[PDB]
Amino acid sequence: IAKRAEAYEAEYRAAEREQIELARKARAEGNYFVPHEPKLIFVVRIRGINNIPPKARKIMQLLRLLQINNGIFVKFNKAIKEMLQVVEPYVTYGIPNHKTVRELIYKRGFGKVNKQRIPLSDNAIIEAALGKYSILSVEDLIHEIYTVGPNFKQAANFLWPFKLSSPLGGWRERKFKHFIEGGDAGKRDEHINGLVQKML
Amino acid sequence: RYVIATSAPKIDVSGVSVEKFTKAYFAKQKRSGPVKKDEAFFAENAPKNALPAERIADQKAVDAKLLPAIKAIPNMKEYLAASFALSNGDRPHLMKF
Amino acid sequence: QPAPPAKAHFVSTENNEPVTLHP
Amino acid sequence: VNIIKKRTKPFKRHQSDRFKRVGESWRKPRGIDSCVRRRFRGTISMPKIGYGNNKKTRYCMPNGLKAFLVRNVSDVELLLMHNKTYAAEIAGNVSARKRVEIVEKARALGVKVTNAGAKVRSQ
């Protein structure tokens, strides 16, 4: 497991090192550089179960959202991006860095065995359910989650919806307007990081 | 916890043997129910729980080997004998100890 | 199967200098 | 385990304090016009299964021993192996002589008799 962890931990740097390098080249050259896009997104609910249109009620069921303040890890693509805009005033998403993808599966990491919520406090809890996909521990699970791989669907169905608390320090002032006019709803991009460092 | 530490000038305690004191030194004197010869219901006595000769002896001993130490520091013999009492117009958090 | 979104790439500006606009 | 109660004030049927025909034992209201049935705030509470007490410290006196009605001298004998989890409560209609013999034997079994002192003035 450590032999896998040493490979993963050095790789997170070796991809963070190059985006340090590959921007230090272009900015000193006059070239421009779009980044490797976000492929993972993390969706946290903002509104309760009251007065939701039936069109947006089904979709949040299809994202394991059944309670206010639930985070989930879901694969981000086109057909996910156009699905989030129709539930946009009832969710909130953004890019997770490596720290939140650690602190959410170490603090509030709960697996799904026999349709029961069983925590991720032992590798044998993970080896039983996800052994057949070469996932052997939390560190294999973090790599497979955060660095999206082929089994990401088979791993996002393992973790429970991340039931979080209300953010220490509160939200912003008035909550249910789009994030780009104050408030907090819709995409938060890198600022979903500083939101999970409050609830957790 | 019921002691407020103070930055008042220190003294020399190398001359006093504190290892004589242990957690059984200050242990209470063991009620122990010595046989009372049940007639004791009527007749009552008392040992006056007097401090034993050992306690009064070392009290003179340990003080004799620290009194010259606080005699060296001025205002120290009379610092001890006074008491501490904050007054209206004082507030313990911002004052320094 | 879905069409994947876009990875990164350089874009040179020797023949295309960024012009400055105003709203 | 220290005994605990989720509630100490019993439940008291609605408006059974005003009217003397209406008794104080609880009766769930049956009308949807009711303020109480809809559970308006400020009105009295109701018996629910939420106030159920611990399934191990149930039926226990505040001491910790459960009760047991001993109505004759061979009903305290069963409590020989259960003297640290049962208290021998004597029944009420037992005579003031048959009572004084349960006490003198329950005391040999180390069993707490809760009301051994009734009708029994000692000399």
């Binding site: 050259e29 006059g30 170490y106 069983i118 925590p119 032992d122 | - | 200098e17 | -």
Partner: protein, 51 residues
Amino acid sequence: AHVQKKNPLKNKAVLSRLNPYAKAYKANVKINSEKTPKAAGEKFLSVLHEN
């Protein structure tokens, strides 16, 4: 089994039970020194300070 949910961020024993890498991390490696060079192109600084 698992009577309490221990926290592997705030407990330093369950962390080693879950992650057999905590005996070698070195979170802060000095990958630079005094000799860090400026990499700021002229034409980028021209388009930076334009307008």
